[PDB]
Paper text:
Genetically encoded calcium ion (Ca2+) indicators (GECIs) are indispensable tools for measuring Ca2+ dynamics and neuronal activities in vitro and in vivo. Red fluorescent protein (RFP)-based GECIs have inherent advantages relative to green fluorescent protein-based GECIs due to the longer wavelength light used for excitation. Here we report our efforts to design, engineer, characterize, and validate a new red GECI, K-GECO1, based on the eqFP578 variant FusionRed. The other distinctive feature of K-GECO1 is the use of the ckkap peptide as the CaM binding partner for the Ca2+-binding motif.
To gain insight into the molecular mechanism of K-GECO1 Ca2+ sensitivity and to assist future protein engineering efforts, we determined the X-ray crystal structure of K-GECO1 in the Ca2+-bound form. The structure was determined to 2.36-Å resolution by molecular replacement. The crystal structure reveals the distinctive features of the ckkap/CaM complex in K-GECO1 (and presumably in other ckkap-based GECIs) relative to other RS20/CaM-based GECIs, including R-GECO1, RCaMP, and GCaMP6. The major difference is that the binding orientation of the ckkap peptide to the CaM domain is opposite to that of RS20 to CaM. Another difference is that the RS20 peptide consists entirely of an α-helix in the CaM-binding region, whereas the CaM-binding region of ckkap consists of both an α-helical segment as well as a hairpin-like loop structure at its C-terminus. Examination of the molecular interactions between the protein and the chromophore at the circular permutation site provides insights into the mechanism of Ca2+-dependent fluorescence modulation. We reason that Asn32 plays a critical role in communicating the Ca2+-dependent conformational change in the ckkap/CaM domain to the chromophore in the cpRFP domain. Saturation mutagenesis of Asn32 of K-GECO1 resulted in a library of variants that all had dimmer fluorescence and/or a smaller Ca2+-induced fluorescence intensity fold change. These results indicate that Asn is the optimal residue in this position. The X-ray crystal structure of K-GECO1 suggests that the indicator has a self-contained fluorescence modulation mechanism, similar to that proposed for R-GECO1.
Residue numbers in the entry: 6 to 110, 121 to 184, 188 to 411
The structure:
Amino acid sequence: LIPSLTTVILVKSMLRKRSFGNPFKYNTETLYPADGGLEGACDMALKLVGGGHLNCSLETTYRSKKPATNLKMPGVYNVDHRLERIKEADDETYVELHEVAVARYGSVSELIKENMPMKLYMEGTVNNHHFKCTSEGEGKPYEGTQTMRIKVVEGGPLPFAFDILATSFSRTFIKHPPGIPDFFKQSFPEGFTWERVTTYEDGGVLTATQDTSLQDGCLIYNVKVRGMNFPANGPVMQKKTLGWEASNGQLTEEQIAEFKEAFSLFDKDGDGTITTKELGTVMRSLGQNPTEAELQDMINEVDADGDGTFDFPEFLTMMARKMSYRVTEEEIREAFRVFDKDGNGYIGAAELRHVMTDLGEKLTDEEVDEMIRVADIDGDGQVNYEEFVQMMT
Ligand SMILES: [Ca+2]
Ligand SMILES: [Ca+2]
Ligand SMILES: [Ca+2]
Ligand SMILES: [Ca+2]
């Protein structure tokens, strides 16, 4: 099968982020410097039973315990997060959470190693109900991954969804690329604090304070949570939540900006309308050689109003449908074929550079190699189907 239009945008996106990861399945925090700390802003969407979402906004403040003079402040940047549930008890009193966190758009603490363990003590109140959780875990602070095994030890089973505590469970594990100073790793040995206010649509408000420190090679998290004004018959207090959407509900401006460039690639005459001819050059530049009818089938997926072409608003809408949906098994196979131009089953550095050029993206040779090495588990220097699929999941 001829790679689909969305597959092409996927691959383009994977390259923009220099990662064989799924680039769509993330939720974005923006970090701004501010009086020698950082301010974090984020929007998140809790899935309800019966469809629909509960939106909240998070405003976090991050302060370092180290003096101002020993810290290289970053610019403004974003962290992309993907929080997942690997295990649970029915009652949500044992919860194993996995997170992936990557800086976008670094520092090396001698104290922060490639595998770090962590331990957390959480105490708090949600609509005056008292509880306690403990956890232990580990991760790879430079690769951006971590696992936390959580227990509720008092106040359980909780009379509210566990979901509202998820973001209160690890900032040292954010992968920061070389260009971005990592305020979190630089804070040690002393560590850092945060205070967060999450405000929900329906008026529930969850505040939390957190101390991070480092005791003899293990990170120690100490967190205080005060949740209030959650509607007593709402989906939080009645446990009618199905987890956090690993996305944003509407497209951000920077998503619209990103996708406008991906559109420009196709729009060779810049008249705002894409034809089979213009899709044709792009498809052929990726090694396909499709017929007019096949190119038309591809435009038919995008062309709502039936006039044979598509414009930018229809293109955008298709990307929104894909952001609210998910990347499929077929799309992953198609994406691999595209990367693997010579069909030998191995994605090499040279292929990445040809494909990169076909899709109007530019990576340095350090970026090209890091993108491979990260996926490359057998160490032969290339990416095979199995390695690719692991990364994409
Ligand atoms: Ca055009
Ligand atoms: Ca149209
Ligand atoms: Ca190859
Ligand atoms: Ca390999």
